[PDB]
């Protein structure tokens, strides 16, 4: 928990660096890169310098690699020029030039290092292991050349149905009835358990016996049922119950339910009228016989077959996929890391790690918050010992928002329980000092607020050059942070949407109308500018809500675009029109299939046009005859030139340029044409392509090339983006309507508080449910920290005293169940008055509160 400078850190052993939000995380790593390349840093520096072919740096996303490499090249080039000129401007290069020992030697090393940049080691994890196993694959025993693959979902869908054929068809009717009850198809079976198939298989609490069979489990459940069914009929007939002060005579109804129930065993559910078998109920409504407490012993254990069938399918699906991939010899990202881990698990791990230690005596990892225990095991085993080799980890406990992307947060604390060097940056460079003070104060309410004693938020300071940043509104300035609050004792999600969307649209319209006349200005000191559409954005949670926000925004005639959409282009009507046009040009014989193509909107005709086209045989035959030659041009030329020729011949580019909003319809045609060229060469039959188009119509695959390009990313519009894509993107101003709403998790999945192993529990354990809920609340607070960043001038949000309970006025609100409610109520059942007092207790001149009316 110390400070940090790039020229002071001793580069030995294992070090962990946490640089908070708005630090940059790039201006430091290049400085340390040059520090290792030139071997400076006093006695604390490395014993010997290195070369560019030894400094391995691994990030995760694809686009960051080239950007980091280009910034590195610019930095080393500028450092070389500044070293040859002995006069710099950047203070970092100034202090480095102060620390230079021999300028000629440094310049010679930079000359010999810059020209070797083209092969420097910057990779992703998959690329790193791909380039390491093909280097030393003797211990692994894998093939030299392989064909990669990504559409493993269809393989898993085949495998689960293959299992479901053999483990359901020979089953008898009485066994299969319970199977049919809980779910019907292997499609739903795969949909239920898909989320655990990828990555590392989890340890299952309370495993079934190794040779246990569904018939044996059914027999065991029957043997537990029928004893209490039949031997209790020995005990029926005697009214041993004593009427207490709350003793109800309806006990005979529950006794008669047993007599009605014990005939057959063809069902599976027990009678719900067995509630009063608690022995404590003597003063409520002595046990005097053990059956009245063995009934509750039976009731305490739920009866189901899912606990067996899930594990039995989960082993064999993974086994069958891993064995079926062998006969084709393909490869996958999941399989490659497992192969490398297995090669470590073999006896030759010491030999395999010695070569890696010799080759790369360093490692740097960016965005460490997305790591798996497998990867951390690899890193720990390779670099947990053996001095003269160091390891620098850089990441953030916050912004870890990839829990569904196979990224575990507990491995970070597991690493921090072993490493023992912690440093933190202080500067921000981006936001206003008032905003920094407010975001420090609001998270400085209660200590260890992240529900964890391992993530302590510490204050940070702003920059000395952004202190002149102000946001004014008709003269005087404006508070940086501001809540908005409902009016009413109780409220619902419908009110939460309907009032606040209208209110937010009203305030955005007020800003848009005011700033166009020079009323409100954004100045850094004196240099001001008005507010436009581009400098106004909003942040949301999910997609289904966004229709409300878009409609409320466009009701006041405001251009709204939803940048978060990853929709396939094949969904729109352009694909339908292209299919119709290709079908009609393949078969131009019939009148119906040709007038179907000419009746499309893109040809642009009218009722009189079609009516004249029907009765005029000559003008009909002209259009018939042009397709006769067009089909021959199609056969001779492939796909693309005819899509160019029919584009040019009818001259429909200027039609969609003249018609407003037609550019979105135009761009999708060109994108579809570029999509067709990867199939028009590998396939030749004209039947195959028109079959292929209708084949992909029914399946919107989520490939990155299938999404829609931006129609106008060039001018001033209003942006609506989600939290997950908001990482790293700066905005001037932003709103936040839906920060109060939340959804409770109910699926049993939790990590151990000591071993940190992702253990999955089949049976419903309330302790595990509570641990999972605590982890989910920590994730939501991390989301809140992500959301309350990247606002250089001002951002604002609303809040409601929403209750999830059915009866409203009980005095027990459910705000503290959410993330922001814990920040104000600190785990207290409250109401509007108490929440109001908590809001205005800390309301002083930076935070300003306000009431919100439905206007």
Strand partners, 562: 720
DSSP for 30-82 reads HHHHHHHHHT-SGGGS-SS---TTS--EE-SSSHHHHHHHHHHHHHHHHHHHH
Chain Cα centroid distance, residue 358: 37
Method: cryo-EM
Residue 343's nearest CA partner among 373, 371, 381, 315 is 381
Cβ distance 204 to 163 under 8 Å?
Answer: no
CA distance 853 to 570: 44
Q: Which two tokens stand for residue 815?
A: 């705000």
CA–CA distance, 821 with 831 (Å, rounded to integer): 11
Q: Is 20 annotated as a binding residue?
A: yes
Q: b/e for 151-178, b at 16 or more Cβ within 10 A?
A: ebeebbeebbeebbeeebeeeeeeeeeb
Distances (CA, A) of 492 to 594, 803, 834: 54, 7, 19
Task: Provide the 3-class DSSP secondary structure of residue 550.
Answer: helix
Confirm or deny that 837 is annotated as ligand binding.
Answer: no
Domains of the chain: 1-150+332-425 (3.40.50.300), 151-331 (1.10.3170.10), 426-564+711-855 (3.40.50.300), 565-710 (1.10.486.10)
261 in a labelled binding site: no
Helix (H) or strand (E) holding 193: helix 186-193
Q: Give the Cβ contact number of residue 599 at 10 Å.
A: 13
Whole-number Å distance between alpha carbons of 78 and 30: 12
The answer to whether the CB of 674 falls within 8 A of the CB of 709 is no
- Classified as helix, coil or strand, 84 is helix
Give residues with Cβ within 8 angstroms of 423, minimum separation 6: 2, 3, 4, 9, 15, 16, 17, 18
21 marked as part of a ligand binding site? yes
Structure tokens at 142: 């894998």
d(CA 846, CA 741): 25
Rounded to an integer, what distance in angstroms lies between the CA atom of residue 501 and that of residue 736?
10
By three-state DSSP, how is residue 718 classified?
strand
Beta strands 731-735 and 560-562: pairing type? Answer: unpaired
**Helix, strand, or coil (residue 755):** coil
On whether 26 is known to bind a ligand per the annotation, the reply is yes
Question: Which residues, other chains included, contact 602 with Cβ-Cβ below 8 Å and sequence gap of 6+?
Answer: 577, 652, 665, 669
Those residues whose C-beta lies under 8 Å from the C-beta of residue 300, and which sit 6 or more positions away, are none
Nearest to 9 by CA among 340, 508, 491, 423: 423
The span from the CA of 792 to the CA of 435, in Å, is 8
23 annotated to a ligand binding site: yes
Other residues' Cβ atoms within 10 Å of the Cβ of residue 765: 15
Of the candidates 831, 798, 837, 833, the residue with the CA atom closest to the CA atom of residue 816: 831
196 φ/ψ angles, rounded to the nearest 5 degrees: -105, -5
Find out whether 88 is annotated in a ligand binding site. Answer: no
Report residue 77 CA to chain centroid gap: 38
Annotated binding-site residue? 237:
no
């Amino acid at each position: 928990a110390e400070t940090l400078d790039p020229l002071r850190l001793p580069l030995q052993g294992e070090r962990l660096i946490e640089a908070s939000a708005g630090t940059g995380k790039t201006f430091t790593i290049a400085a340390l890169y040059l520090r290792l390349l030139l071997g400076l840093g006093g006695s604390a520096a490395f014993p010997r310098p290195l070369t560019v072919e030894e400094l391995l740096v691994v990030t995760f996303t694809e686009a960051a690699t080239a950007e980091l490499r280009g910034r590195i090249r610019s930095n080393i080039h500028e450092l070389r020029i500044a070293c040859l000129r002995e006069t710099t401007d950047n203070p970092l290069y100034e202090r480095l030039l102060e620390e230079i020992d021999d300028k000629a030697q440094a310049a010679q090393w930079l000359l010999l290092a810059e020209r070797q940049m083209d092969e420097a080691a910057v990779f992703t994890i998959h690329g790193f292991c791909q380039r390491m196993l093909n280097l030393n694959a003797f211990e692994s025993g894998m093939l030299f050349e392989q064909q990669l693959i990504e559409d493993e979902s269809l393989l898993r869908y085949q495998a689960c149905a293959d299992f479901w054929r053999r483990h359901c068809y020979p089953l008898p009717r009485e066994i299969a009835q319970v199977v049919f009850e809980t779910w019907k198809g292997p499609q739903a079976l795969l949909r239920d358990i898909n989320r655990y198939l990828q990555g590392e298989a989890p340890v299952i609490k309370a495993p079934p016996p190794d040779d246990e069979t569904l018939a044996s489990r059914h027999a065991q459940i029957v043997a537990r049922i029928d004893t209490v069914k039949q031997q209790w009929r020995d005990a029926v007939g005697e009214l041993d119950a004593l009427i207490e002060s709350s003793g109800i005579d309806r006990r005979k109804f529950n006794r008669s339910n047993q007599a009605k129930w014990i005939d057959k065993i063809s069902a599976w559910a027990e009678e719900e009228t067995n509630s009063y078998q608690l022995p404590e109920s003597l003063e409520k409504f002595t046990p005097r016989h053990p059956l009245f407490e063995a009934i509750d012993q039976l009731l305490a254990e739920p009866l189901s077959i899912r606990d067996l069938v899930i594990t039995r399918a989960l082993a064999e699906i993974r086994e069958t996929v891993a064995r079926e991939k062998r006969r084709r010899g393909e490869l996958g990202f999941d399989d490659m890391l497992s192969r490398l881990d297995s090669a470590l698990r073999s006896e030759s791990g010491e030999v395999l790690a010695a070569a890696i230690r010799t080759r790369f005596p360093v490692a740097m990892i960016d965005e460490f918050q997305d790591t798996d225990p497998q990867q951390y095991r690899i890193f720990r085993r390779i670099w947990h010992h053996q001095p003269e080799t160091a390891l620098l980890l850089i990441g953030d406990p916050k912004q870890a928002i990839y829990a569904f992307r196979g990224a575990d947060i507990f491995t970070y604390m597991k690493a921090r329980s072993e490493v023992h060097a912690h440093y933190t940056l202080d500067t921000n460079w981006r936001s206003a000092p008032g905003m920094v003070n407010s975001v420090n104060k609001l998270f400085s309410q209660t200590d260890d607020a992240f529900m964890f004693r391992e993530i302590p938020f510490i204050p940070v300071k702003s920059a000395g050059k952004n202190q002149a940043l102000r946001f004014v509104f008709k003269g005087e300035t404006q508070p940086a942070m501001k809540m908005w609050l409902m009016e009413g004792e109780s409220c619902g999600v419908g009110d939460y949407q309907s009032t606040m969307a209208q209110v937010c649209a009203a305030q955005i319209r007020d800003w848009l109308q005011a700033g166009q006349r020079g009323e409100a200005l954004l100045m850094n000191g004196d240099d001001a500018r008005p507010v436009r559409a581009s400098d106004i954005s909003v942040l949301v949670r999910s997609r289904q809500e966004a229709a409300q926000v878009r409609d409320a925004l466009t009701l006041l005639e405001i251009p709204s675009v939803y940048l978060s959409n990853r929709d396939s282009v094949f969904e729109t009507l352009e694909a339908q029109e292209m299919l119709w046009l290709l079908q009609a040009v393949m078969t131009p014989e019939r009148e119906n299939t040709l007038r179907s193509a000419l009746a499309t909107s893109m040809m642009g005709l009218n009722a009189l046009d079609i009516e004249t086209l029907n009765n005029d045989e000559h003008a009909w035959d002209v259009v018939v005859e042009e397709f006769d030659g067009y089909r021959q041009i199609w056969r001779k030329r492939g796909v693309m030139p005819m899509l160019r020729a029919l584009m040019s011949a009818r001259n429909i580019a200027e039609n969609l340029l003249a018609t407003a909003g037609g550019e979105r319809r135009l761009t999708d045609i060109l994108h579809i044409s570029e999509l067709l060229q990867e199939a028009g060469t590998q396939l030749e039959s004209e039947h195959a392509l028109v079959r292929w188009l209708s084949q992909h119509i029914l399946e919107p695959d989520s490939n990155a090339s299938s999404q829609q390009m931006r129609l106008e990313s060039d001018k001033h519009l209003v942006q609506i983006v989600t939290i997950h894509k908001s990482k790293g993107l700066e905005y001037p101003l932003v709103w936040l309507p839906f920060i109060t709403n939340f959804r409770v998790q109910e699926q049993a999945f939790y990590h151990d508080r000591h071993s940190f192993e992702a253990v999955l529990d089949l049976n419903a354990a309330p302790e595990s449910v509570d641990l999972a809920e605590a982890e989910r609340l920590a994730e939501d607070l991390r989301l809140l920290y992500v959301a309350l960043t990247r606002s250089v001038w001002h951002c604002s949000l609303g809040v409601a005293p929403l209750v999830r309970r059915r009866g409203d006025k009980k005095g027990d609100t459910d705000v503290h169940q959410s993330a922001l409610g814990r920040l104000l109520q600190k785990g207290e059942p409250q109401d509007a008055a108490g929440l109001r007092t908590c809001i205005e207790a800390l309301c002083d001149d930076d935070i300003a509160w306000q009431t919100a009316q439905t206007g």
